[PDB]
Design a protein around this nucleic acid. Structure first.
Lengths: 115, 210, 69, 177
RNA sequence: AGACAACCUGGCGAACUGAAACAUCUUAGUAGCCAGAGGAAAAGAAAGCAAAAGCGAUUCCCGUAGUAGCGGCGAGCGAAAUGGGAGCAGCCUAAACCGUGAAAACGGGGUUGUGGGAGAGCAAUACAAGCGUCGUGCUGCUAGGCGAAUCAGUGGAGUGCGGAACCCUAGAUGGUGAAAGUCCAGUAGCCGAAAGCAUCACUAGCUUAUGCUCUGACCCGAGUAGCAUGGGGCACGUGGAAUCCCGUGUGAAUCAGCAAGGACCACCUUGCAAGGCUAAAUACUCCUGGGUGACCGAUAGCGAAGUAGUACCGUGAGGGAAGGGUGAAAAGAACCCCCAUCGGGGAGUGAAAUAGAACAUGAAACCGUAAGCUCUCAAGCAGUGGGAGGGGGAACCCUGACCGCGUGCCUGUUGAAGAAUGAGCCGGCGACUCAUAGGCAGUGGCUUGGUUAAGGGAACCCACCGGAGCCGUAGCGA
RNA sequence: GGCCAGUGAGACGAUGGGGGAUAAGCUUCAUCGUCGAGAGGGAAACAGCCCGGAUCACCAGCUAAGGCCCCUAAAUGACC
RNA sequence: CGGUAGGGGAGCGUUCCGUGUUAGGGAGAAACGCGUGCGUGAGCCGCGUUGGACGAAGCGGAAGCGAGAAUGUCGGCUUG
């Protein structure tokens, strides 16, 4: 009542295809194609949560420079004394985004904050 | 339940012959009739599927090479299951399945099957046959003029099964004659076009009550 | 087609009591009783019901005996 | 009810779990047998009622009572209580009763030892209608109930045991009143 | 007089093992070896079982009962009678006395049992059975034959498809360019044998037995039963240890006797030993014929789909492989050119030969080739999130400058990336299965009961039958 | 209570102790924490310390332990 | 709503059988890939080729039933 299979070849062609552009044996050699697959998914997690964290970082430093451009000692620190004291509903470090597109606008923001 | 007109060779509507059969409670009918089928055709099978274990295959029982001092696995016979030479683990050997199904339940699978096929244009019904020189032409033409012929498996049965209809019923593959001695759950469980005779309608009624 | 033999060495020990629960017999009685107080001796005679742990070592080891629980 | 349409009720059958197919199944790998030990190893395994070297409970305890020789037999006469007899199935009061009548009635069925049983009428239970019983010796309390009822009751002599002539003659000699 | 697959009887007869060690015990009287014989063998017609009631030669299945019991009362072994079925079948001899006798010996009467047979009388015994002589006649086996019904269009080919007829006691099967009751061999049904062989029947011979009764007191399987003693097997391990066969030595009576009825003794009940034969139900397969397959289909199934117990290996016993599929038909490639006639390109065949003979689908590892983008101040379990620059058919896919994060996978550990294990890679083969039983849960049937098992059933499955048996109805007590 | 498992040498840290030499990442017990079986951030790297408990998505925000010169986010911010 | 040993619940898939000489199929059955189509996922729908013959779906049944780990194992291939 032999019951032999082929469902491996599909089980495994699928992976064989998800691991393309893997530049070594990591793209040919099934028995390692598997663990590679696993490890790409894992780094997809860690790089995803770390991407939220990472883009905050990038905007903090970018807005921080735009503010320090005022030649007097301002900061990304003190800009937020003054940006929450005056009720501005959280421009969400995307004032760091216009700060590079509409810089004159960000100088308008900044002057209204100083008042 | 529901009545049903008797037919004849000509195909008209003499008689009433109301048929009442004991049936399983609703919502319990499928389990009751399914289980009955599956004991039917599970029981019927036949083992006829064998194989050889590590002990019967002809390969020898010489330790092919010593335990240690060789760099190689610990193979212990060339009749082993792992080697592709033979020796199957847990192969099929002739098992003899059989499913004792309680008589008073099995009956009720029949009564349910029948009692479900009737009253919805799936039970035509006759009273007799007179064939001489049995010839499979008058009979199939009977089916034609009779009820539904179309050679669509039309289970069909009778009482005491005179030879000269047995002998002209076999040529037609779709419908097979039945007798109480030969009654089975399977073929009366198309509910498609099953016929009866009055000997079966009362014999049937007699066997199962309410 | 085979059957399960009953560990006779523990059917000569137990018993079951209509309401269906194993009893047994207490130990240390036919040997060295000058020592033993009376009080202890009529405590070492009463057939007492048996604890649960072994009540599961045996109900499997003695299968044809109609015990419930 | 076509063959295709029929299906079995839900929960009627449960697919047997196959141990070791995959981790996702959860019985894969170890299979819940854990790691190592006698239980894990394939084989007959440790005998039940075995304490791993401590005296088994059966061994420590003395064998019950009277173990060596004993009839250890109870049943002699099958016993059918009056409440069971008077109540439930009810006799016409026209009917004879006895073991043959009872088996037919179905109140009492003797299969393993039809021959060994003689029958007995228990004191317990009350019979609404007086009846005549040809059954052998009954309990006094039970006997009293029938008499109070007034139903005719007749003792039955089942068998006679052969005795040695000398012994038989001795009994006659005693006949001193 | 040799041969044998398995089944059987006999003799000899282990051990690893289970007892969580091991000497009693268990594997087990199994395996194996030797010796016979059969299609079956062995057993068998009562010195039996029973239990105040009855049975009636053996042999098997169910079930009593995993009960009674045995057991370093440990592991474990485990009956039987009653009950139900399958199958039935009974005979021949040894005395006692008679007719012979070169005193052995043969002939005839005699064979049964709450006791028959050796003894005494008929109105001319017949029906019954077996066997054989050869002989006769059907029934089957070993050849075989007759045997119904259609064509068109489609597309390399039609049995498929659309259309249109017919047969069917024959839509069982195998083939036929592609699948069909109507193409072929066939099948239902029917006819058939020199001759050989079967299972029966009959026509004529031997042979059948208690047709009956009564009063004596002869014999009624002689170094055997007992006993002592040593054992073996009995379900029963020397235990109160019966029955049952054996080694050593003693060594009864026979019917107003003897053996058994679980030491033994009485009374009662059964059977009557030390001579023999006998069919069936029954276990088996190297095999033959018929059929079937929720069996395999090319490392599977026989080890074996071709010179497979082959090649090969060993002195020898013995071990033991791998190798299948061009096409419907070789139509297997005329001729030409490169040409050591290896192998090729045209031509030709074919529907197709990038189907051309190390030829049928053809995966992955591995070996190349071409195109797109890219690496030579680099640093990395080599991916990932962000994406510079460029190429693609004109927002999605390829490649990737540079930054950040990221200490292989499984086993296994208090603890591994671990410099602990394992794996060269790829593809396959490869692991909690079945049988029967106890317990529990889910589901269903039935119920003032539930269920049948063996066994039958015009095969096997099976409707229906089969109530023996089991479970639930009364406990306490050794 | 029923049906059924796995486990049976844990490790360190805090405390009270024995043994040791008030030596050990030692050993042995008692009461708790983490690891075991648990990720994430701080600790440069770093099971067993600190905050904390991961159903998922988010190119949104507020904080804890810890921090604000550069490499890396955030004052080379105030005054003693 | 972390989770190893382990327990319970719900599912997919493969060869075969019932419904069948099924629906469909030489305008063409399966292995390879385009579709982030679709699913929590095992996997499913579609989509193509020289070859190219079989065979779904649904409700059910059975299992020689799911593989990178056994210094496994048979074959083909590499590294040096």
């Amino acid at each position: 009542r032999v019951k032999r299979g082929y469902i491996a070849r599909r089980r495994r062609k699928k992976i064989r295809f998800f691991a393309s552009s893997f530049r070594g044996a990591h793209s040919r050699l099934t028995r390692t194609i598997a663990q590679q697959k696993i490890r790409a998914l894992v780094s997809a997690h860690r790089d995803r949560d770390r991407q939220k964290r990472d883009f905050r970082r990038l905007w903090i430093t970018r807005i921080n420079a735009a503010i320090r451009e005022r030649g007097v000692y301002y900061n990304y620190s003190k800009f937020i004394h003054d940006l929450y004291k005056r009720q501005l509903l959280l421009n969400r470090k995307i004032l760091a985004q216009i700060a590079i597109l509409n810089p004159n606008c960000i100088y308008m923001i900044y002057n209204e904050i100083i008042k | 339940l529901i009545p049903l007109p008797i037919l004849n060779f000509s195909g008209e509507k003499v008689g009433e012959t109301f048929l009442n059969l004991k049936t399983a409670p609703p919502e319990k009918a499928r389990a009751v009739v399914h289980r009955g089928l599956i004991t039917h055709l599970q029981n019927k099978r036949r083992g006829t599927a064998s194989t050889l274990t590590r002990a019967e295959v002809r390969g020898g029982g010489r330790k092919p090479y010593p335990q240690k001092k060789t760099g190689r696995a610990r193979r212990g016979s060339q009749g082993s299951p792992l080697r592709p030479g033979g020796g199957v683990i847990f192969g099929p050997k002739p098992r003899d399945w059989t499913i004792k199904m309680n008589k008073k339940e099995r009956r009720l699978a029949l009564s349910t099957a029948i009692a479900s096929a009737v009253g919805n244009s799936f039970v035509v019904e006759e009273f007799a046959e007179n064939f001489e020189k049995p010839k499979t032409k008058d009979f199939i033409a009977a089916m034609q003029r009779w009820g539904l012929d179309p050679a669509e498996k039309s289970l069909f049965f009778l009482m005491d099964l005179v030879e000269n209809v047995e002998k002209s019923g076999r040529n037609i593959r779709t419908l097979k004659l039945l007798t109480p001695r030969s009654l089975n759950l399977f073929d009366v469980l198309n509910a498609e076009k099953l016929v009866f005779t009055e000997g079966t309608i009362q014999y049937l009624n007699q066997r199962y009550g309410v | 087609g085979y059957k399960m033999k009953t560990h006779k060495a523990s059917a000569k020990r137990f018993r079951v009591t209509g309401k269906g629960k194993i009893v047994r017999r207490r130990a240390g009685k036919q040997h060295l009783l000058a020592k033993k107080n009376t009080k202890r001796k009529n405590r070492l005679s009463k057939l007492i019901q048996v604890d649960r742990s072994d009540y599961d070592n045996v109900i499997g080891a003695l299968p044809y005996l109609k015990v419930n629980r | 009810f076509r063959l295709d349409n029929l299906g079995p009720q839900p929960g009627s059958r449960k697919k047997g779990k196959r141990k070791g197919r995959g981790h996702a199944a959860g019985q894969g790998g170890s299979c819940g047998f854990g790691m190592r030990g006698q239980k894990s190893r394939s084989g007959p395994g440790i005998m039940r009622g075995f304490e791993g070297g401590q005296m088994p409970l059966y061994r420590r305890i003395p064998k019950l009572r009277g173990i060596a020789g004993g009839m250890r037999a109870g049943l002699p006469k099958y016993v059918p209580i009056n409440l069971r007899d008077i109540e439930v199935a009810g006799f016409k009061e026209g009917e004879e009763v006895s073991l043959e009548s009872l088996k037919a009635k179905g109140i009492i069925n003797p299969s393993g030892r039809e021959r060994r049983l003689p029958l007995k009428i228990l004191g317990e239970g009350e019979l609404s209608t007086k009846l005549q019983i040809k059954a052998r010796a009954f309990s006094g309390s039970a006997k009293e109930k029938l008499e109070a009822a007034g139903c005719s009751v007749t003792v039955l002599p089942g068998r006679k045991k052969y005795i040695k002539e000398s012994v038989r003659k001795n009994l006659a000699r005693a006949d001193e009143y």
